[PDB]
């Protein structure tokens, strides 16, 4: 089988929120076969944060809804780490005036993808 690491497996923008500030950060997010880097913009030439596959301990799905409020797009997967959970899915922008239909694949192909570089992690069944 072909035996190439292109390098970052996912990117695009993307936002997510604990359950202490739920303060929803809005920035490209990375992922790799080692961690999931952050960089704040697009232009931006550093990375803001690097989420580290160790720090995960958990993937589950949104089944949460008490945090953010009945009419605020609500998260795609949790990331249940070892400081809160997060809440990464789509983003709240629910209005009329040229539509940008699109909004769902998107987050799921991260829930997959995360999960599958987090194979690496120390979760081993």
Same mark, same amino acid.
Request: charge should be neutral; hydrophobic fraction near 30%.
């Given at each position: ?53 160790? $720090? *995960?301990? %958990? ?9 953010? &409020?009945? +009419? /605020?797009?609500?998260?795609?997967? $949790? *990331?249940? %780490? ?9 983003? &709240?922008? +629910? /209005? ?30």
């Amino acid at each position: 089988g072909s035996s190439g690491s292109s390098g970052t497996l996912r990117e695009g923008w993307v936002v997510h929120y604990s359950n202490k500030d739920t303060l929803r950060k809005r920035h490209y997010w990375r992922l790799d076969c080692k961690c999931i880097t952050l960089f704040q913009n697009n232009t931006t030439n550093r990375y803001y944060k690097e989420i580290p596959l160790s $720090e *995960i301990l %958990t993937v589950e799905s949104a089944q949460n809804f008490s945090l953010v &409020p009945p +009419g /605020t797009n609500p998260h795609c997967f $949790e *990331i249940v %780490t070892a400081n809160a959970t997060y809440f990464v899915g789509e983003m &709240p922008g +629910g /209005t009329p005036g040229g539509p940008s239909g699109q909004g769902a694949e998107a987050a799921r192909g991260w829930e997959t993808a995360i999960r599958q570089a987090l194979m690496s992690g120390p979760s081993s069944g």
